[PDB]
C-alpha cells in the first residue's frame, strides 16, 4: 500500500539526512573525522624524528630550511643541517647526502608534509570538518618557515593559503602526509647517547627506517583515509538518490507501474548506499585499532622548553567514542531498513 511505502521512504530519508548531514550523530562524519585526526596524531607522535634535507640536484646547493610549529608553545624543525660535536649548529648535515627512498626527505617533500599538516590542523581548529553533504567554507591557513641569509641572519616567512574545510580537500592533505612517508620511507633520528620526553620506539644506537618501525601504522592510516574517501563518495551517491513520497495515492495515471518501480529501485540504491557507508565506517574503526595498538599505543591517544612532540594531541579517543555511539544508533535502526528493502523488492 501507499501508506506503507511512504513510511519506508520517510525512514530511509530521515536516516540518510542524519548520515549525510549530521555531525555528532553521523558515523560517516565521525569516521571521516577519525581518519583526519589520526593522521594529525601520527605526525604529532613521530614526525619530529623524520630525517629531512637531503640534497636533490647538487651537494653544492647546501640548502637548509626551518619549519615552524605551534602547540601553545612553538617549536622549529631544521631540515638540511646537523649538530657539531661541540654543540654548535652546522650548515653541513643531512644536505651532504642525496635525498631518496630509505634515506631522507628532500626539503620540497618536507615542505609539502608541513603545509598539508598546517592546512589540516588549521581547518579543523578554525572551522571544524564540514558536513559530508556540504560544500564547506573558505578559510585562510598560515604556514611559517625560515631560512638562513648571507652570513648573519635568519629570515622568517609566514605564507597564507586560501583553503576549505570540506572532507575531500582535508582527506587530500592527510593523504599527502601518509603517502610521502609510506612511499619514501625516510630514516628516523635515534636518541642520543624537538621532543622533551623520548617514546619507547625511539631507541639509542642505530636509526630506524620509518617504514620498518611504522609499516603497520602507515598501512592502517593509509586504509583509514582511503575508506574515508569512499565514505565521502558514497555519501554523494546517497544525496543523489533521494526517493520522493507518493502523492495522489489513488491516481494511477500519476502513480504508474513504471514510476513506482523506479521509486522502489531508487529506495534500494539509497538503502544499499547507507549499508555500504556503515560498513566503511566500521572498517575505519578497525583500522584505527591497527594504528593505535603497536608502537604508538601509549602515545597517539594522549596529550599533556616544553612541547607535545611524541604524543598524538589530536582528540582521537573522543572521536572514536562518538563514532561508536553514533554507529550503534544506526545499527539499532537496521530492522526498519530491512523491511523497507523487502517492501521495495516485492515491487
Amino acid at each position: 500500500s501507499a501508506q506503507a511505502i511512504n513510511q519506508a521512504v520517510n525512514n530511509l530519508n530521515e536516516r540518510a539526512k542524519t548520515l549525510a548531514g549530521g555531525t555528532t550523530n553521523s558515523p560517516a562524519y565521525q569516521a571521516t573525522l577519525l581518519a583526519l585526526r589520526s593522521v594529525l596524531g601520527l605526525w604529532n607522535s613521530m614526525g619530529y624524528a623524520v630525517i629531512c634535507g637531503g640534497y636533490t640536484k647538487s651537494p653544492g646547493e647546501n640548502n637548509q630550511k626551518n619549519f615552524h610549529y605551534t602547540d601553545g608553545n612553538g617549536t622549529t624543525i631544521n631540515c638540511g643541517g646537523s649538530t657539531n660535536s661541540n654543540g654548535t649548529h652546522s650548515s653541513n648535515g643531512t644536505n651532504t647526502l642525496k635525498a631518496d627512498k630509505n634515506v631522507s626527505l628532500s626539503i620540497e617533500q618536507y615542505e609539502k608534509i608541513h603545509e598539508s599538516y598546517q592546512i589540516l590542523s588549521k581547518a579543523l581548529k578554525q572551522a571544524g570538518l564540514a558536513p559530508l553533504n556540504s560544500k564547506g567554507e573558505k578559510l585562510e591557513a598560515h604556514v611559517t618557515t625560515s631560512k638562513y641569509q648571507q652570513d648573519s641572519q635568519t629570515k622568517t616567512t609566514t605564507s597564507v593559503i586560501d583553503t576549505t574545510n570540506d572532507a575531500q580537500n582535508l582527506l587530500t592533505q592527510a593523504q599527502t602526509i601518509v603517502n610521502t612517508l609510506k612511499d619514501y620511507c625516510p630514516m628516523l633520528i635515534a636518541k642520543s647517547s624537538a621532543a622533551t620526553n623520548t617514546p619507547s620506539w625511539q631507541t639509542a644506537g642505530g636509526g630506524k627506517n620509518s617504514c620498518e618501525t611504522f609499516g603497520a601504522e602507515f598501512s592502517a592510516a593509509s586504509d583509514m583515509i582511503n575508506n574515508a574517501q569512499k565514505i565521502v563518495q558514497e555519501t554523494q551517491q546517497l544525496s543523489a538518490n533521494q526517493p520522493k513520497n507518493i502523492t495522489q495515492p489513488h491516481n494511477l495515471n500519476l502513480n504508474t507501474p513504471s514510476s513506482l518501480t523506479a521509486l522502489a529501485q531508487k529506495m534500494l540504491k539509497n538503502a544499499q548506499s547507507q549499508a555500504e557507508i556503515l560498513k566503511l565506517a566500521n572498517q575505519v574503526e578497525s583500522d584505527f585499532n591497527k594504528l593505535s595498538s603497536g608502537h604508538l599505543k601509549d602515545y597517539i591517544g594522549k596529550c599533556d622548553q616544553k612541547n607535545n612532540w611524541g604524543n598524538g594531541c589530536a582528540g582521537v579517543e573522543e572521536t572514536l567514542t562518538s563514532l561508536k555511539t553514533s554507529a550503534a544508533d544506526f545499527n539499532n535502526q537496521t530492522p526498519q531498513i530491512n523491511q523497507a528493502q523487502n517492501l521495495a523488492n516485492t515491487l
Binding site: 657539531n84 651532504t96 634515506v103
Partner: protein, 108 residues
C-alpha cells in the same frame, strides 16, 4: 676517542695507490662523505654513502679512481701530482651529530 685518518703508505709513488684508513669510526651512523681538500664543501665532494643503501653516490671531485668501503676507507688508485694535499671525511651519526677528520699523503 676522536675520528682520525691514516694514510697507507704515508708517501706514494706516482702511478701507485694510497688507502686512507679511518680509526675510531662511530658505531651508529646515518652516513658519511669524502671531500677533496681540507673543508667539508659539496663542490669538492668525492663520494658519499648512506648506511642501508648498498650503493655510494659520487660528487664533482670524483675522478673514477676512488673506491669507498663501509669501514669508511677511501682507496685512490693511479695517483698523480694533482692528488697532492688534503682529504676530509665527514661522518653524520644516527642522532645527527657530525664528526670530521683530515687526511693527507705526499706524492713523488
Amino acid at each position: 676517542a676522536k675520528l682520525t685518518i691514516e694514510s697507507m703508505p704515508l708517501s706514494v709513488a706516482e702511478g701507485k695507490e694510497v688507502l686512507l684508513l679511518v680509526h675510531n669510526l662511530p658505531q651508529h651512523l646515518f652516513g658519511y662523505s669524502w671531500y677533496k681538500g681540507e673543508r667539508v664543501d659539496g663542490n669538492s665532494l668525492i663520494v658519499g654513502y648512506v648506511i642501508g643503501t648498498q650503493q655510494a653516490t659520487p660528487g664533482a671531485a670524483y675522478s673514477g679512481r676512488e673506491t669507498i668501503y663501509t669501514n669508511a676507507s677511501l682507496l685512490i688508485q693511479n695517483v698523480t701530482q694533482n692528488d697532492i694535499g688534503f682529504y676530509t671525511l665527514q661522518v653524520i651519526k644516527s642522532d645527527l651529530v657530525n664528526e670530521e677528520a683530515t687526511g693527507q699523503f705526499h706524492v713523488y
